[PDB]
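Exercise: predict the structure of this protein bound to calcium ion.
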Amino acid sequence: TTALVCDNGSGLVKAGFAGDDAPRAVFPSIVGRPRHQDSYVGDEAQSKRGILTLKYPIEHGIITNWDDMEKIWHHTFYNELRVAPEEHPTLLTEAPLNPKANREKMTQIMFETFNVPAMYVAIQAVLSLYASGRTTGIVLDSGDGVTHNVPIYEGYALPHAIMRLDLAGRDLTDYLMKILTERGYSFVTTAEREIVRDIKEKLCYVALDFENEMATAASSSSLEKSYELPDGQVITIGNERFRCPETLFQPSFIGMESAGIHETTYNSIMKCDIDIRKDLYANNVMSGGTTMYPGIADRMQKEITALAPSTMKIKIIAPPERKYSVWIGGSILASLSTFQQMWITKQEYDEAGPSIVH
Ligand SMILES: Nc1ncnc2c1ncn2[C@@H]1O[C@H](COP(=O)(O)OP(=O)(O)OP(=O)(O)O)[C@@H](O)[C@H]1O
Ligand SMILES: [Ca+2]
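Solution:
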């Protein structure tokens, strides 16, 4: 019997079968409901938005509308994976610091609505660590909705040391939209937004030294790249390429007072037992789509080096497949023979209720 793995992202659901190397299904975490006086999920919801009301049930990584989430899961099982959920153990993911009641509700829905035979809920960043071949390290997981630093020791997250940056890929897209709009290219609508998201993913990068890179862009065309818009206009960008993701290191760029991702990484390590910090510094694993920017590992290496003790060995691991590391880690975990005893079964649920999930 094949187990399912579903990574419930703010931006994208990644779903598939345990044992596979990649998720079979990747689609936007959007539900379209009929306008009042029949529902759609993903690309089709966006396509038909003129007759629907769009819902975003995963906000900053936390599931906030259960009826809409049920529609996403229904779509995942029946339309994307083409399975009957009552026939498959199902591993779901959750954000770091997910409230206990939320995990319990996820469990209730899986058993009572979908009648899964068994299930488990794992923390996203922990799965990404496993996908890197490690059980000790500190993960920087940055997706569409939220960014976390999650230090992990001997296979388990250390919740007291988790840090959360309330900015991720959507904010970076929005910021690039603002920058390009001010330059005379109006990007405000959803169709325009998708174009800006694509520009971001294709052309943006993280500068090793932001001030140096600004100087280069001011004095040369060497950093310029062009992009043809759907209306046939060709837009050229230079410093916008690296100003956009610089926001991860300087959240003040979008008016946030927060520490940048290098600082939150360091702060997280400093909340951990002094005896494990050496191992965390040597095992900083990057996951999620917003860690895909060229240059980000080298910048992280530089910034952590500046904050850490001078003798400290620092290593950033940024796997090529890291857009899907969470899902992959779930696939690996759910495939382990020793994990099979860890599934919560429907029998156990019937006996004990949702609280069993902790
Ligand atoms: N090559 C790339 N460069 C920059 N950003 C990218 C790239 N590829 C994807 N992204 C961004 O990554 C985000 C999607 O990443 P991911 O699937 O990890 O997020 P998620 O799991 O849905 O969100 P979260 O974990 O925050 O709830 C989007 O904002 C997308 O634009
Ligand atoms: Ca994610």
